[PDB]
Amino acid sequence: PAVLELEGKKWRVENQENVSNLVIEDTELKQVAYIYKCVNTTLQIKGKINSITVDNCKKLGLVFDDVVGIVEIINSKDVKVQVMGKVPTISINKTDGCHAYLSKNSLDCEIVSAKSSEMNVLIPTEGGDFNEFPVPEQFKTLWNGQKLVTTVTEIAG
Amino acid sequence: PAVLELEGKKWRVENQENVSNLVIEDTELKQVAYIYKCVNTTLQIKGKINSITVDNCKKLGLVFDDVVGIVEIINSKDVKVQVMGKVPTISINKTDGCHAYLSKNSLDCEIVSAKSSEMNVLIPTEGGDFNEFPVPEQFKTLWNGQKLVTTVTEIAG
Lengths: 157, 157
Description:
Two copies of one chain form a homodimer.
Chain A: E1 3-7, E2 10-14, E3 22-24, E4 32-36, E5 42-49, E6 51-55, E7 58-67, E8 70-74, E9 77-83, E10 89-93, E11 96-101, E12 110-114, E13 117-125, E14 129-134, E15 138-143, E16 148-153
Parallel strand pairs in A: 2-4, 3-5, 4-6, 5-7, 6-8, 7-9, 8-10, 9-11, 10-12, 11-13
Antiparallel strand pairs in A: 1-2, 13-14, 15-16
PDB class: unknown function
Keywords: CAP, CAP1, adenylyl cyclase associated protein, actin binding, Structural Genomics, PSI, Protein Structure Initiative, New York SGX Research Center for Structural Genomics, unknown function
Assembly: dimeric
């Protein structure tokens, strides 16, 4: 059954299906959110918390204000994440199809990726618009005679 | 049922299970090999052919002589590949656990990877021994203010 309740420091939102108005109004700086097994859902978290984690979600739409640490999108499909404020790092792991919408205050965000595909970082521009840039998913590795030297095969549309 | 027969230019070896002596003696420069759905199998291909493709194999052990073009290891788990002679590129895609054993004559081989994990390139050393090097599977991406700049997070044991 669909869950959405704070359990200690953890904001548990799981098993959501075809909902799109989910909102977590209250919030504490040391809290964390764990969005699990949610498909075709849309969630918004108001306030600055410690970290978020999208695990095993499909067609999930997330939008948050601030995160003190990390935002993880693991084992998912077609996830959309948006920062209104600031986020240090957004880590995409074992996820296929992910769009990270940054903001004027998180242009310094670091995008860690692994075993993932179809990732795009949307950059904000004066006028509520975003430019799309694909993050590389393929790499060419070579032997130096001393070590392995890896290059990134840049993606284009 | 287990298959292993030349069908045109294609050397079809599929559905093999718990075999380990498979060998393709004959060989033509324009042929290709397609190892499909083979688990806990060991195959050796003698001679120089155009290309090999390991698709959907588990615990597969392959060893070939020469390849004119590419060796693909796609959608697999725990695959071991070894070149006695020369191979231009070895591409690992959607594969978890792959060990590429190179040779004195293919040290210039290129290792293309994507959506894969646990990959290692074994480099030969005077004495029938190999040194192991893990190929990167995680990447850090940053916004330039002009473009995205991707760095490789180097793997260590």
